[PDB]
Amino acid sequence: QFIPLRNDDIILIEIQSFTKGEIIELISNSAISTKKAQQQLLQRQLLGSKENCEMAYTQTSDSETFSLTQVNEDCENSFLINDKKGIFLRYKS
Amino acid sequence: QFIPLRNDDIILIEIQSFTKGEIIELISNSAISTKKAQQQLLQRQLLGSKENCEMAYTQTSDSETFSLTQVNEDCENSFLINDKKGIFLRYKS
Amino acid sequence: KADHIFNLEEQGLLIDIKDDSKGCTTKLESSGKITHNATESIESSADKQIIENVKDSKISITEKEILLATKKSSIMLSEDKIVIKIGNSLIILDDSNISLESATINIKSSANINIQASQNIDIKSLNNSIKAD
Amino acid sequence: KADHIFNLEEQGLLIDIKDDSKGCTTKLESSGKITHNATESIESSADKQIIENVKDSKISITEKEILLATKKSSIMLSEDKIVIKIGNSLIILDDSNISLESATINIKSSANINIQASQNIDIKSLNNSIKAD
Amino acid sequence: KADHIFNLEEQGLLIDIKDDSKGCTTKLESSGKITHNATESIESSADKQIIENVKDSKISITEKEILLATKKSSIMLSEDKIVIKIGNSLIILDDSNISLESATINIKSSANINIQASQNIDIKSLNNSIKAD
Q1: What's the distance, CA E10 to chain centroid?
Q2: Which chains does chain B touch, 3 or more C-beta pairs < 8 A?
């Protein structure tokens, strides 16, 4: 993978000597399930600048949705896969 | 990514002081190639509860299959990509 | 304000492409049906053939012919030659000829039978050629 | 040296499948159009029906019939029986029979009217049956 | 117990949708062919036109017309008016009129020519109008 450190994250930094600092861990995210672990089971990767992607996988109490959505100005691409309906492809505005 | 710690995994835990424990490493998996590294080359991500997904990529001695399968009760979604045949989509039972 | 769907269900493909009011909906259902719909038109061109069969009942198209054929019935709309067959009963239409061949001929009407001719008439026959008044 | 595309745009599906020179391009545009193209042929078989409608103007196909029907006009290319209707004016063609029924009949030509018969002729009429020379 | 496939190969799309025995298989092969299959039916409706062309050999459909036209041959199944053209040879069928126009007319048979008329007959001619017995 090549996912370099974007801005606006939070990092522990050691200073191991004089003029030698290092980067160790991450204390940050961009994608979290803000619901109570019974309504949803999110497993996703946001990507890109402006965060206009998801490699989401949501399982609620009812279904399972695999999805590859995008949001733009007046373009909403997707790639849905359920267990109940099937395989989708959409383009809305 | 947001892949929180599911159950039934195995973890090294330090106890760095009194009433302060921490979580460091993972000693566990759910997806492994149980064959002899000449029959298969698995590179996959299982996902979700019940583990009914694969973002698999198998290269045997013959072909290369990129796949996004699902197994349910009487629903077998997929998304196959070979090098020999092409691009698939399936729904079986 | 468009929508675009591409399903795969136990029913089958349900490809519709909708505008705010218009649309073009196609299916391929697993119960053996193929349907199509539109709101304006359906065009389908080719270069040599358009053949539509239900177990030998053709409608074929070539660059010059149009057949509407079954077993024992055909319309051959060729270039400059039209044939209509039920063997043996024919109507052949040419550039300057209309021929009508059969075994028997019944011609009924109610009011008039104008049979003009801008040149001569050659009626032939056998034993009877009767009339009434 | 093939290409294969499967789009989804604001226009709609543009499925073309091209060889080095040949191709099979289909669309379903969101402006209400369905087109198709080929370089060799289009076949489309079925097992019971092929029905093509524009608000009651059919072309239907069964295992034995072919209808080309609208409101108040039809061609029923059945097996061994051809009907052409504008009610009330009929042309029924059988295995060994040609019947032509109407109200009035006009028959013009320019040069000849050969009406042969290999057996007898039974012309019937009413009050007038006139001629000229 | 359904199957659903959506390929893309060097051959082309092979979309089949199968039940346990039934099916609806479509292709678009890269060798210039388009085929379709079904086990029950094919319907295809529209709203204005259905035009099928192989380099000017139409079968067009409107809300009222049906043309089966090529170069120099046509059947115009309009509402209440049927025309069959090979210029110059026409058969025009109306509500209460059958007209048949040509240059020459040949009419053969084998057994009978019944030409009835429930009112008068106006045969016209020129120099000859011959017969035999």
Answers
A1: 37
A2: A, C, E
